């Protein structure tokens, strides 16, 4: 009986430190790296990382008692399920709001529409605020920490940030100051807002 | 034999369980709000979850065969181990440049003193750039992410940003905007460096 | 350099529809809400309603949801708002303004047989 | 339902002096936590123009002739320095609720 519970169990245990060894290497040398196809790893990343622990809650409440102290391991499994519940509902709501696919993200459910030259590129933000930076950087926009590409000092005057509930802002770019070389600091402070 | 290795196993996986679940309570609702005491728990979490890979890593060499393919999880502990080893050494080397003492944070080695009223606060940045951007946001100064306490527009005209090997810059204030009531973006480009 | 033109003056009977244009020049079409006020009766200024030139999203005003519509055509650049049902309190000044800072010349209706 | 009644009926001030205008809002406009309140100048065949988008800080290309200041539901529109080119038509808009009414119009002659 002892084989193939430990065959299992290291198995599991081993599985796990994968797991933080991709964490590890991701977040020590690669935080914020250029991440153009590294953001999507990270976000798909916590979102497999939710049924992880969600397993290791309710695998913790089926080989041992489940009424004195185990109960417990269940009970804190529930919880977490529902806040799992309550991500996709609000996120089905963003999605009901916008169209931007750009949802489902498991950090914040925030939307940046930034009509940059082409077409509209959608990033998550983190909250919504009045100001908003932006910089160049040789020619490397970085707007609220999200790398969008080649850019100069000619930006674009209007960005859109909605929420989900009730929340759609604009931002009016003012003030654009320049850097030497082509660096910039541009700005983004809120004007209207639409309800609904 | 069954029962031992059953309640230790389950120990381990119930106690994985639970860091996960402090990391997904961490994330979720709190991953930027005020990080004031917060910050500080991140980081001792991420140092103390160093030595649970490693723990993880070690431990699943040691109850199973070490030459055909056991031999990896032995053998991807050492690097984690020489990067854990590295880590020290270059906060080492932090830590003999400058007496911050906010050194030895798992994110990165980078210092960035801002003189605000009063006496000089230290924070850990992520990468050293040329500009630097800062709102207020009613009253609530935030310089690349850090919340700083009140201020207003009439901010610090100098920053600066210390690096480990041989790099110790500085940044000043230039254009700072106002934004309505006492909002501000206020920036900062870096014009002298000092070696060694 | 952005810049509005409009369709001109135009006259119209009473229960007929008609068209305006926002032709648009200097910036990429796509981007902006292409907000639309109404002005007659001396200077009373009003809302009309905006349009997404990206993917449809119009919003409307309870006064004006059903009395015009917007559509966009994103190859000309250029808007093409609808009028249905005109009446004598709809000969007005109507502007298309981007960002509440670059506004058009601004259409004159006059709605009388 | 968030009609704004501005109460200069008709402004007549000379050179130099100041004019204010005093845009009242309806009822509790001050959505999250700030007023979006826009200032309008409109000069006779011409479309309006914009000073101010968010209650101060006006926009660039603007001369600082032009302040806002206020909040919950008295706002201040202040030009301290009357030159000569100058008498327009000035509106109020709130960009806050369901509607972006604007306000009555207050008309701002030069006094020779």
């Known amino acids: 009986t002892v084989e193939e519970l430990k065959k299992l169990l290291e198995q599991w245990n081993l599985v796990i430190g994968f797991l933080f060894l991709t964490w590890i290497c991701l977040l020590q040398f690669a935080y914020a790296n250029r991440n153009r196809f590294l953001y999507i790893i990270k976000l798909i990343f916590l979102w497999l990382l939710w049924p992880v622990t969600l397993a290791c809650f309710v695998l913790a409440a089926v080989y041992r008692i489940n009424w004195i102290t185990g109960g417990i391991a269940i009970a804190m499994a529930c919880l977490v399920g529902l806040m799992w519940l309550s991500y996709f509902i609000a996120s089905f709501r963003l999605f009901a709001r916008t169209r931007s696919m750009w949802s489902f993200n498991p950090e914040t459910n925030i939307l940046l529409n930034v009509p940059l030259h082409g077409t509209i590129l959608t990033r998550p933000l983190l909250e919504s605020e009045l100001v908003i930076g932006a910089v160049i950087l040789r020619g490397h926009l970085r707007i609220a920490g999200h790398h969008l590409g080649r850019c100069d000092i000619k930006d674009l005057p209007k960005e859109i940030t909605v929420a989900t509930s009730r929340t759609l802002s604009y931002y009016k770019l003012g003030a654009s100051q320049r850097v030497a070389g082509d660096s910039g600091f541009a700005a983004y402070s809120r004007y209207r807002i639409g309800n609904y | 034999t069954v029962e031992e290795l059953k309640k230790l196993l389950e120990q381990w996986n119930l106690v994985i369980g639970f860091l996960f679940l402090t990391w997904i309570c961490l994330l979720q609702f709190a991953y930027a709000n005020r990080n004031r005491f917060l910050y500080i728990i991140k980081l001792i979490f991420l140092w103390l979850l160093w030595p649970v890979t490693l723990a993880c890593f070690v431990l699943a060499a040691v109850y199973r065969i070490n030459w055909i393919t056991g031999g990896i999880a032995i053998a991807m502990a050492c690097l984690v181990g020489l990067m854990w080893l590295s880590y020290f050494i270059a906060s080492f080397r932090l830590f003999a440049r400058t007496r911050s003492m906010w050194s030895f944070n798992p994110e990165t080695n980078i210092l960035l003193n801002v003189p605000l009223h009063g006496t000089i606060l230290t924070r850990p940045l992520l990468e050293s750039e040329l500009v630097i951007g800062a709102v207020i946001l009613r009253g609530h100064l935030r310089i690349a992410g850090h919340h700083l306490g009140r201020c207003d527009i009439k901010d610090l005209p100098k920053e600066i940003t210390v690096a480990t090997s041989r790099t110790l810059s500085y940044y000043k204030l230039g254009a700072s905007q106002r934004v309505a009531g006492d909002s501000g973006f206020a920036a900062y480009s870096r014009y002298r460096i000092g070696n060694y | 350099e952005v810049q509005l033109q409009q369709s001109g003056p135009e006259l119209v009977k009473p229960g007929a529809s008609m068209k305006i244009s926002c032709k648009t020049s200097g910036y990429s079409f796509t981007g902006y809400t292409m907000n639309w006020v109404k002005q007659s009766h001396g200077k009373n200024l009003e809302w009309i309603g905006l349009?997404?030139?990206?993917?449809?999203?119009?919003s409307y005003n309870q006064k004006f949801k059903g009395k015009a519509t917007l559509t966009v055509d994103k190859s000309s650049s250029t808007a093409y708002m609808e009028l249905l049902s005109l009446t004598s309190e709809d000969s007005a000044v109507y502007y298309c303004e981007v960002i509440n800072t670059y506004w058009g010349q601004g259409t004159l209706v006059t709605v009388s047989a | 339902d968030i009609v704004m009644t501005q109460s200069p009926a008709s402004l007549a001030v000379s050179l130099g002096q100041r004019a204010t205008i005093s845009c009242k809002a309806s009822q509790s406009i001050d959505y999250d936590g700030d007023n979006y309140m826009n200032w309008y100048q409109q000069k006779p065949g011409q479309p309006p123009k914009l000073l101010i988008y968010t209650t101060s800080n006006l926009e660039s290309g603007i001369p600082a002739r032009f302040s806002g200041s206020g909040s919950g539901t008295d706002f201040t529109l202040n030009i301290h320095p009357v030159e000569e080119g100058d008498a327009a038509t000035y509106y109020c808009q709130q960009n806050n609720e369901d509607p972006y009414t604007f306000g009555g119009g207050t008309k701002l002659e030069i006094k020779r």
């Open positions: 349009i997404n030139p990206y993917n449809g999203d119009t």
